[PDB]
């Protein structure tokens with residue numbers, strides 16, 4: 001039951017490494033999971049629903065990892081604190097490049113994918129703005145831009161730059177350089193007067 | 194001749210304000226430009242080709258405006274210099290939101306659109322990195338990240354943040370706040386040690 005479901009998810013993640021959602025059939029997903037086509041339809045209404053679940057799992061893994069960090073502050077300076085936080089996204093989505101890529105393409109077509117992404121983006125920007133505000137209240141960061149607008153641009157930067165690096169787009173920051181590049185911009189723009 | 198072509202371009206830009214490329218037909222473009230369907234095909238091979246031309250004109254208008262600026266340095270401090278430069282993109286693409294939006298959607302499907310965007314992105318990042326390097330050589334900016342990697346992330350930020358503001362995405366920086374937000378991040382990340 002849960003195993004047929006996991007099998008179908010594992011198949012879809014594997015096939016998405018080699019071709020886009022468009023070039024993958026329900027029959028393809030069913031064959032790789034070792035079930036028939038009508039059995040597939042019992043677990044998922046469509047291949048698009050399979051992607052939505054895969055994306056949902058990846059987004060929540062990142063979200064849970066960031067909640068863990070939040071509850072367990074690393075004992076280090078502020079630059080390393082922000083690095084650990086962006087690193088949750090670098091590692092989680094970078095461990096699932098095929099779902100990340102397909103998920104991002106699906107935002108244009110699936111209101112469900114668009115809404116899932118928008119909900120968690122709002123959550124991560126609000127957390128980012130809360131930390132900036134705490135830093136300002138403690139006197140560690142200067143009161144420059146509206147924290148929530150600063151947070152929005154910096155999370156949008158990370159979305160676009162990480163995902164270009166992972167896809168090897170032209171142009172992109174090499175993946176072995178993207179964490180340091182983003183940490184620099186976050187730290188200078190948050191602490192710089 | 195050039196007028197039928199301009200008519201078709203003007204129609205397509207007008208229709209793109211109200212619905213996406215998918216929901217617009219060749220017959221729709223032909224009717225609005227006051228020509229028949231086979232006459233349309235004489236000027237453009239497809240509605241996708243019409244979008245490519247519209248995007249091409251918008252990208253080159255921005256590129257030419259930025260070349261003008263480059264050749265005619267504004268007499269003001271460095272923060273206002275970067276503001277004038279990002280402002281070329283804020284005004285040019287913000288004056289053509291429907292083409293911007295459709296152009297960005299078309300990157301997923303049209304290799305021509307993808308290649309046009311990637312070529313000019315490379316050009317603007319190289320110009321951005323050249324200015325940062327000049328600033329470092331004159332001693333006005335510190336030698337922190339690789340200028341070209343810094344330039345790449347900051348231009349990717351502007352692409353994603355401007356285009357979210359213009360589309361009124363959730364989340365986004367309000368359009369009346371996006372120029373100040375981006376100038377802050379560029380200035381702190383370029384000059385900050």
Ligand SMILES: O=C(CC[C@H]1CCOC1)N1CCCC1
Pocket residue numbers: 082085086089090121124127128155158159162
């Ligand atoms: O890198 C980040 C988030 C950055 C972390 C760093 C501390 O707060 C959020 N994102 C990319 C995908 C969406 C958000």
Ligand SMILES: O=C(CC[C@H]1CCOC1)N1CCCC1
Pocket residue numbers: 275278279282283314317320321348351352355
């Ligand atoms: O804002 C910018 C470019 C910023 C200017 C500012 C000085 O050099 C480039 N872009 C958004 C669309 C692509 C690039």
